[PDB]
Amino acid sequence: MTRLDSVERAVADIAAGKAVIVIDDRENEGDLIFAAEKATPEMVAFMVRYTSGYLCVPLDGAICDRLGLLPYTVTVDARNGIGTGISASDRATTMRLLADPTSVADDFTRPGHVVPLRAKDGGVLRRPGHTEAAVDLARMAGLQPAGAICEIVSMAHTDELRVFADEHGLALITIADLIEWRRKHE
């Protein structure tokens, strides 16, 4: 039985501009998660090092509506003030722009190097996904409702995640504990 951090500690990490690891038990894997507005070259570089592939930016529905994605096919880069879009610093800039409450589709170009995702209203109480968890944590940290997530390159699995989390000072939580915390403190 591997130690899980409290939701309160994960929220505090998010608020301080740090990352956390979130496990679900849908699929049963770990995503690295930070708040999109907190993206830096250093944190994106860190995420790039351990991503299985894509870096995604979960966004609240209102943000998606504003940007024009209603209801991976869609990738974006910031239109201005970047290189080709793939550097850690370019991706960080793209991430921050997606969290900026005045960004519009015009501020971005497609295709690009960051994947926006639409979180279900209600967050993990509605759909217990990593996408919703990332938005929930940012919102709980008092930040714009916009996260940055990747699946970490792949019990023994939850064990290795605990060591990895500790080596980098990250909180490790489950979506179940997040659902439970939200039910109680909301």
What are the structural domain ranges in the chain? 1-186
Enumerate the active-site residues: 27, 31, 56, 72, 77, 113, 130, 151
Residue 74 sits at φ, ψ, to 5 deg, of: -110, 120
Question: How many beta carbons lie within 10 A of that of residue 184, not counting itself?
Answer: 8
Fold of 1-186: DHBP synthase (3.90.870)
Residue 160 contacts by C-beta under 8 Å, 6 or more apart in sequence? none
How many Cα atoms occupy the beta-carbon half-sphere of 118 within 13 Å?
Answer: 15
Q: Is 17 annotated as a binding residue?
A: no
Residue 56 bridge partners (DSSP): 115, 149
Cβ atoms of 127 and 21 closer than 8 Å: no
Q: Is 128 annotated as a binding residue?
A: yes
Classify 173 as helix, strand or coil. Answer: strand
Q: Is 127 annotated as a binding residue?
A: yes
Residue at 101: amino acid letter: P
Q: How far apart are CA 80 and CA 62, in angstroms?
A: 23
Cβ atoms of 117 and 54 closer than 8 Å: no
The residue to which tokens 């015009």 are assigned: 106
Q: How far apart are CA 92 and CA 114, in angstroms?
A: 9
